[PDB]
Ligand binder design. Sequence first.
Ligand SMILES: NC(=O)C1=CN([C@@H]2O[C@H](COP(=O)(O)OP(=O)(O)OC[C@H]3O[C@@H](n4cnc5c(N)ncnc54)[C@H](O)[C@@H]3O)[C@@H](O)[C@H]2O)C=CC1
Ligand SMILES: NC(=O)C1=CN([C@@H]2O[C@H](COP(=O)(O)OP(=O)(O)OC[C@H]3O[C@@H](n4cnc5c(N)ncnc54)[C@H](O)[C@@H]3O)[C@@H](O)[C@H]2O)C=CC1
Ligand SMILES: O=S(=O)(O)C[C@H](O)CO
Ligand SMILES: O=S(=O)(O)C[C@H](O)CO
Ligand SMILES: [Zn+2]
Ligand SMILES: [Zn+2]
Lengths: 435, 435
Amino acid sequence: ISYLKKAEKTPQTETATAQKVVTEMLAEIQARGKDAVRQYAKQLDGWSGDIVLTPDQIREQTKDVPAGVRADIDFAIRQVTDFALAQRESLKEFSVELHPGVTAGQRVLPVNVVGCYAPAGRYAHIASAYMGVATAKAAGVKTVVACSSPFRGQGIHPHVLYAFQAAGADVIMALGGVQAIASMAYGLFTGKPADVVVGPGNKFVAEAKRSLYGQVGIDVFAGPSEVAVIADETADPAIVASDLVGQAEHGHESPAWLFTTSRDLADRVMALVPELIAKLPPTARDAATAAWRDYGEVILCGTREEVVEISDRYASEALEVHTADLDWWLANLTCYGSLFLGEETTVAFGDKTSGPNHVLPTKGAARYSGGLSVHKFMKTLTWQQMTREATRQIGQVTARISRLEGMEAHARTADDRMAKYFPNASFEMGTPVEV
Amino acid sequence: ISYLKKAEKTPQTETATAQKVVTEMLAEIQARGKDAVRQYAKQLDGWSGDIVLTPDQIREQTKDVPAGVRADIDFAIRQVTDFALAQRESLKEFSVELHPGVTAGQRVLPVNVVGCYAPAGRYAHIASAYMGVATAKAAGVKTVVACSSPFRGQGIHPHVLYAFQAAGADVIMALGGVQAIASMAYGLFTGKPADVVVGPGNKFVAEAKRSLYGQVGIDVFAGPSEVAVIADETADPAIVASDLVGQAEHGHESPAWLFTTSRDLADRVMALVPELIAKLPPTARDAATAAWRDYGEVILCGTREEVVEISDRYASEALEVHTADLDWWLANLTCYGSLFLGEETTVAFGDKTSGPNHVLPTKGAARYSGGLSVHKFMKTLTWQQMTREATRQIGQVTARISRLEGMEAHARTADDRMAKYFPNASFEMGTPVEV
Ligand SMILES: NC(=O)C1=CN([C@@H]2O[C@H](COP(=O)(O)OP(=O)(O)OC[C@H]3O[C@@H](n4cnc5c(N)ncnc54)[C@H](O)[C@@H]3O)[C@@H](O)[C@H]2O)C=CC1
Ligand SMILES: NC(=O)C1=CN([C@@H]2O[C@H](COP(=O)(O)OP(=O)(O)OC[C@H]3O[C@@H](n4cnc5c(N)ncnc54)[C@H](O)[C@@H]3O)[C@@H](O)[C@H]2O)C=CC1
Ligand SMILES: O=S(=O)(O)C[C@H](O)CO
Ligand SMILES: O=S(=O)(O)C[C@H](O)CO
Ligand SMILES: [Zn+2]
Ligand SMILES: [Zn+2]
């Protein structure tokens, strides 16, 4: 295992800056509520307008959105919705018998209110807007509040707004960043605090969601976008290089990783990536140049197993696999947000319209979670019921363990049932706690 | 809706104290690592022994655990495992065709390393020990690190230790509180950082997990225990009262709630609870007296619908239902951690040996999450693969949407595939970005 390109910075590098800003802003917002948010909206995003859009404003701001644009977004919404409904079917309710007379089961219930964030800064994240909202509706969530940042010194990008509306948002707000996340968490402006807040964003957005976990549920830590490509000698260096640059344009902090067993592939890609970046237009060129320099990495490995080991350690948001024997890679990789098998599909496809959600774990979160999905909006709750007969065993065990732990009042709830249901039975219910 | 008893305190009252302590302690542990943890163990828990238990120590400390105790714990481990294995079956892998030629699927994979906390302070939480570890093993997790607080002069309570060992823990540490949670998160002492940290504890433990979310996944915010009872005129006040007192003994901060449509039931319960508490031994009496006084509430409602409304808003960790027509309540209740239908079962049974997990959401977390389960250790990841033909539709939509967003490099990954796979095709790929 050898690093042909090592990065100066990682997803961890900017953590402290993000956490500093978020701690300050959240303190302010907790203390000063809506006034703090309007002021942050003013000073950060130059926004003095109304925050909650009326139906009139939405209609007005999207009236001129062309039919061909709407057709593309509607098509994407359908793909996302279809995959979401398939995922919903994968998680089932059930009941079982355990000890005789003990019935237990699992209920699967949607949350009531979701807040969805769609980012807008360098780019306007049209696709993010339907990724959150369409998924929440597919999960059967009753109320969906959606926010996106005022873009390029104006309001919500009209195509983001269209995405939100067509995906089924009930409330739309022109709010960005930390103040958006906090507003949705606390129910500022709407009076409807979210049960779950979802959606991608820069390091401040992702840290704000992470800090507010508890107050709300979340999808996943979904910060500056990442990409890894696993490639063997069959891979096409021109396509690999193209794919790396594709995510590098997200911004200065987006890492692009190449893991390969072919030095010839690595070398060609390392030559091609700067060339591809130089041909980009200004904003993308600016982002990708910094990202590739500071965060880009290339790792040469000797075997497939070493690639797997490295990939799993990196736990990339998105992982492309351009190799032979794709079944082996599906069977063996274990840590990634979203997997793209073979050359034909690619991350940008997943980003816009493949179907599976693009809101995905960054900064190692793929070690413990997949991305936004209907699963993040379903609660899996347990229920149980017993016969009186079942409590003969369950009760005596409960009383004895409870007493071993020191929990006398717990044990008495079992004693009381035994005395009531079976006044003639006599069991070892454990030595009463005296201290 | 009338408050026959209104609480002066709620689960939210103590949040500020918890956060202050946790912020300080986590800062110290980030700064000083193992040195801070050894210092906290000495100063908070009076422990200056080794932290990681050796195989010989475990054998030696569990050698005189009687056969009767072992049989009860083993029976409980069986019930938890049985229900866990059933829950595991409820979440399926799948693949589907979306747009023709687009294959997308869901992989369900266990995390690599889990940290389990079993509390020990007022009481020694034997059941908590198997709740975490047995569930992790049922999920297929290969490495389980297990911690419990030094209890009453010694290291880990011997019965907690037996539970950890019999449930299948790989590493066991004598370590409590925030320092335990932190150590498992950062892999201190073991060199094995957890992917997910689970387990219940006091307000500091729960806040530490919440604050470390991101570094690790977690189960849920599982702080000071809560109980709610729904009762109608059919309920037995002696049992209801016993059950409320059962959970109140957990500590000064444990809320016990009664929601009822019967005033007579309410009055008898309110008379009984004090009498029952007075009959408890000192530790439990002290805890329950304060909990009932400060946090206990009793609410009278006119209709079942009002009871559901109020129950859903309280979102209790554990919810007993002593009513007629239990199917209606199962159909209509939406916010609770774990549901106990009918009088026969009770929270204490679920705590020790019913089967469903007892590590459950507090402080309103049941609005967005169920308790600890195999689901908290299973990652739901997505994969996809495409034919070249599929990329004709998917690629053109990607390129157009990308360019609408301003993301030119994204669009170029589609352009490059269209040129390679279909050089003679002419699609609208969008106006290239110039800015
Ligand atoms: N992980 C995932 O699934 C996805 C991640 N992303 C990432 O989302 C990010 C989007 O970033 P942006 O374009 O900035 O949009 P954004 O919407 O995340 O950020 C814009 C907001 O952040 C605020 N902000 C910016 N700098 C600030 C500062 N220093 N202090 C306080 N507030 C500040 C702005 O005022 C505005 O309110 C990119 O890094 C992109 O890669 C995008 C899509 C999916
Ligand atoms: N929600 C759930 O599913 C469950 C909740 N529980 C709850 O767990 C709790 C256990 O509480 P404890 O007996 O305290 O056990 P614990 O193990 O949670 O707390 C003991 C540890 O906390 C530390 N600690 C205590 N006070 C501290 C302070 N002021 N500053 C710093 N560290 C401090 C101690 O030094 C020790 O390391 C109870 O409230 C119980 O109701 C128990 C089982 C299940
Ligand atoms: O490009 S998008 O903003 O649509 C999604 C992003 O690539 C995933 O991090
Ligand atoms: O009593 S236990 O500590 O075993 C579980 C507790 O009641 C759940 O909050
Ligand atoms: Zn992207
Ligand atoms: Zn209990």
